[PDB]
């Protein structure tokens, strides 16, 4: 638009260079082609989202869509700079586009107050690149399955034009990670699951009969005492953001800790456990969103070769980045072209407790359904599996 607005971006598009991508061709048009046509979808306005919209917008991207089902909360303000106290309660995706469209002159950010599962093939197909910066692994695996299903194979040969690049970033305190995934070419989210599901869910036995830590006590009240009793009205569920609810979980937890001589129950600790709070700062999000944005640019323009897929950032002791190429599992449940091989209420366990699949509350179907736990009579029902961990149907022979 105005004089030298894109002076910092142009130079990587108009000049030839020694480290350029093999297919790069310096052009004085490329930028405009980038501003007017490259369609990017940002998943999440939380976490990296805000930082991603800024980076992409100041990089020549204009046609950006953001998806988020969340509402602004006071705790967001320590790092989600696109939000202000007055926006508390409003939809994150909305306020985000709103802010950006006003701070960056011609950006056309389109919001979607939805959850990624609300959309299917037809929708995702409209994008050239998808950047995921949301918090849950369930969401990461879900968009991972969507993009793979968009892959079009011709007699066993992948059609490169059916590949939709997925850049995924995450953060945890002063640690974070960014990766580039090329469905059908690179390792996908499911290819390296030995890195994503590492989360905690306290064993029903220790929580109910062997508490040792304050967290166990809180866990007990939340997962058992609240359901049994119904403190705030029959049928009313526990609201993590409700102060009176936390207060109740807190008092009851203290009482349990008292009985087992466990110290440490605290209100702050109760909140952290009820909401599964992950510590978060602006600085680490900036770093990771920066790496991801840079790769989005590279892939859109072929300015340089993409991250040889997986980077880790750590700020605790000094600072460092580490990158390696995650390999594609030739037996992957999600990105392998072939149907998996096995060997009913015992195979459901294999699709759950297992590691290679780690599916959550699956659903098997014979060549006729059976146990579509998603239907309470779907229990008396008690191969083509299905799941909440992906849009596709995993074929098991």
């Amino acid at each position: 638009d105005w004089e030298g607005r894109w002076n910092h971006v142009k130079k990587f598009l108009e000049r030839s260079g020694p480290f350029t991508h093999p297919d790069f061709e310096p052009s004085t048009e490329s930028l405009q082609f980038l501003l007017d046509t490259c369609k990017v979808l940002v998943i999440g306005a939380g976490g990296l989202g805000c930082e991603l919209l800024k980076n992409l917008a100041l990089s020549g991207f204009r046609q950006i869509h953001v998806i988020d089902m969340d509402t602004i909360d006071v705790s967001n303000l320590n790092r989600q700079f696109l939000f202000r106290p007055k926006d508390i309660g409003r939809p994150k995706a909305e306020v985000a586009a709103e802010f950006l469209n006003d701070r960056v002159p011609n950006c056309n950010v389109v919001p979607h107050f939805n959850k990624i599962q609300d959309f299917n093939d037809t929708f995702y197909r409209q994008f050239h690149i998808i950047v995921c910066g949301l918090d849950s692994i369930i969401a990461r695996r879900w968009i991972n399955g969507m993009l793979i299903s968009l892959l079009n194979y011709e007699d066993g040969v992948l059609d490169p034009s059916s590949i939709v690049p997925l850049i995924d970033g995450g953060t945890e305190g002063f640690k974070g990670n960014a990766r580039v995934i090329l469905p059908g070419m690179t390792a996908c989210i499911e290819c390296t699951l030995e890195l994503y599901p590492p989360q905690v869910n306290f064993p029903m036995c220790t929580i109910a009969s062997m508490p040792r830590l304050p967290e166990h006590c809180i866990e007990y009240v939340r997962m058992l005492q609240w359901p049994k009793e119904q403190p705030f009205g029959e049928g009313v569920p526990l609201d993590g953001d409700d102060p009176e609810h936390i207060q109740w979980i807190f008092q009851k937890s203290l009482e349990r800790a008292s009985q087992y001589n466990i110290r440490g129950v605290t209100y702050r600790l109760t909140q952290g456990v009820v909401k599964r709070i992950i510590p978060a700062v602006a600085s680490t999000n900036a770093v990771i969103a920066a790496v991801c944005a840079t790769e989005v640019f590279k892939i859109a323009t072929s300015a340089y070769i993409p991250l040889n897929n997986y980077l880790v950032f750590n700020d605790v002791d000094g600072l460092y980045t580490y990158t390696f190429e995650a390999e594609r599992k030739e037996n992957c449940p999600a990105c392998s072209q072939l149907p998996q091989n096995i060997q009913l209420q015992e195979v459901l366990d294999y699709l759950t407790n297992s590691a290679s699949l780690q599916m959550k509350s699956p659903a098997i179907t014979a060549t006729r359904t059976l146990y579509l736990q998603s239907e309470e009579r779907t229990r008396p029902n008690l191969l083509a599996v299905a799941d909440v961990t992906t849009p596709q149907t995993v074929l098991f022979k």
Partner: protein, 529 residues
């Protein structure tokens, strides 16, 4: 107050109320308000730094407005510091912003002592000469300084702090202080109280793995007399010794005992843990620790105290940390076991308190110029203490002080990121020689390649650095045209902001000198220049 607790919840879980306090009391100074500076600053305002002051003496340009999220088209022509603060202040009302429509040189000319009003100073996009001038002043004033430059796809960051000691370093995956190798009295007593052989089954399968390993380590010890440090033999046989204690079911085959499994999976890192770390010994043997005076900082006092303790009540060991990891066990046994370590940690901390008081006596500094909280925290992190001392910028630029060793060695790899450092130095020569940066204009590139290649050689030979720099880098750096790409400025802005927070809060551990980032390959490296 309650508003803040809610707002800062995600970060309070990282540096606590005390870090937040240190943060809210600080005053940082930013030099130029380019993309690099507003990005660093934004990461300081959001978490809530007490206050900030931008110092830019330039005006907004079409390109500044184009790559900065805190400058609009409407600010083109106005003062950059003034206009940046307008938008940065909008980020957090609890932060008091400010500025000076003056430049660093001018301020250095008139009121140098001006920068003495800051906790830390962040200088960005500065040319060589202004950097050295500013470095000298802040160094003698003992004011912490961080220099940051974005140049094309390269990020650079240099920190300068004479001495930065820290207690609460927040180590990741440190070895638990189990004391299985050098058990204190109460812990010996506690283990004896257990009789795995004669004991009900439910209690057998619900005994802390520390007890299990303890049990078996005494058996293996009263026989051979060894301690088991040979990884896939002694330790592997030991794992078997443990695996043979697993009760057998009615059918004969061993049953499922998760606690013994846990004992097993832990033998590898549980047999050797009580030993003073290298870094601690180095702290103990340092002059500021051995020769105390009236000016000796509270940290070195607590350092010496820890030393005296290691000498007496410690018996060549640091005070028991006090905590243990969670581990499958009945509540009673787990709590009883933990209380032993807790109690023990309390005993050791009191002893350390004495040594401290005794030290404050033969110094007459004060009666309790050190809260008891500082003492409990120091005993918890006695193995994690760290001290960083950066070289001055003068030592780095000196012809006889330059670290040619590090630079020469690094260059063995023609692609080490230390070349980016070299290119930065040369690019600066190109700016003093010529009065501009190379490649700014699409038409200068080709001609600049030769001029820059020459500034490099001059720079190298001058310091006596016989290193090979591939031509590609010279060309690549001209190709950059001094650009300050936003995503590159954002990366450096997150990285730099957190290093500043580490300084202000004294909590994690800062990089020891220079960090260089390459957006081209997405690789980085730290150097001690």
């Amino acid at each position: 107050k309650l508003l803040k607790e809610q707002k800062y919840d995600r970060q309070l879980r990282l540096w606590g109320d005390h870090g937040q306090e240190a943060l809210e009391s600080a005053h940082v100074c930013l030099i130029n308000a380019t993309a690099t500076g507003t990005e660093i600053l934004k990461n300081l305002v959001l978490p809530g730094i007490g206050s900030f002051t931008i110092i830019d003496g330039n005006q907004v340009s079409g390109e500044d407005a184009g790559n900065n999220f805190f400058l609009q088209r409407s600010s083109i022509g106005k003062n950059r510091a003034e206009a940046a603060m307008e938008f940065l202040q909008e980020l957090n009302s609890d932060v008091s912003g400010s500025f000076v429509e003056e430049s660093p040189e001018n301020l250095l000319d008139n009121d140098p002592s001006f920068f003495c009003r800051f906790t830390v100073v962040v200088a960005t996009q500065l040319p060589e000469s202004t950097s050295l001038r500013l470095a000298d002043v802040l160094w003698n004033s003992q004011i912490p300084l961080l220099i940051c430059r974005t140049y094309g796809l390269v990020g650079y960051m240099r920190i300068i702090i004479k001495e930065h000691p820290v207690i609460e370093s927040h180590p990741d995956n440190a070895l638990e202080d189990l004391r299985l190798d050098k058990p204190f009295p109460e812990l010996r007593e506690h283990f004896q109280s257990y009789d795995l052989d004669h004991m009900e089954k439910k209690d057998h399968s619900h005994t802390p793995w520390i007890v299990i390993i303890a049990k078996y380590l005494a058996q293996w010890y009263s026989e051979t007399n060894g301690r088991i440090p040979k990884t896939y033999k002694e330790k592997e046989d030991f794992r078997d010794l443990i695996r043979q204690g697993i009760l057998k079911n009615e059918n004969g085959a061993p049953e499922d005992e998760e606690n013994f499994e846990e004992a097993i999976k832990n033998v590898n890192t549980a047999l050797n843990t009580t030993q003073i770390p290298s870094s601690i010994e180095d702290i103990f043997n340092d002059d500021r620790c051995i020769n105390i005076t009236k000016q000796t900082p509270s940290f070195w006092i607590l350092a010496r105290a820890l030393k005296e303790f290691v000498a007496k009540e410690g018996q060549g060991n640091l005070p028991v940390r006090g905590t243990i990891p969670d581990m499958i066990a009945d509540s009673g046994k787990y709590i009883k076991l933990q209380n032993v370590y807790r109690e023990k940690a309390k005993k050791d901390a009191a002893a350390v308190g004495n040594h401290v008081a005794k030290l404050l006596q033969s110094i007459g500094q004060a009666p309790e110029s050190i809260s008891e909280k500082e003492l409990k925290l120091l005993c918890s992190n006695s193995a994690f203490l760290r001290v960083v001392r950066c070289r001055s910028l003068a030592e780095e630029y000196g012809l006889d002080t330059i670290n040619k060793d590090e630079i020469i060695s690094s260059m063995d790899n023609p692609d080490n990121e230390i070349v980016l450092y070299l290119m930065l130095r040369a690019v600066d020569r190109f700016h003093k020689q010529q009065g501009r940066y190379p490649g700014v204009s699409n038409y200068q590139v080709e001609e600049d390649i030769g001029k820059l290649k020459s500034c490099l050689t001059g720079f190298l030979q001058e310091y006596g650095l016989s290193v090979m720099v591939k031509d590609d880098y010279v060309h690549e750096f001209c190709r950059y045209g001094a650009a300050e790409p936003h995503t590159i400025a954002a990366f450096l802005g997150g990285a730099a902001a957190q290093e500043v927070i580490k300084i202000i809060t004294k909590q994690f551990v800062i990089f020891n000198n220079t960090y260089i980032y390459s957006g081209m390959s997405q690789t980085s490296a730290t150097f001690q220049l």
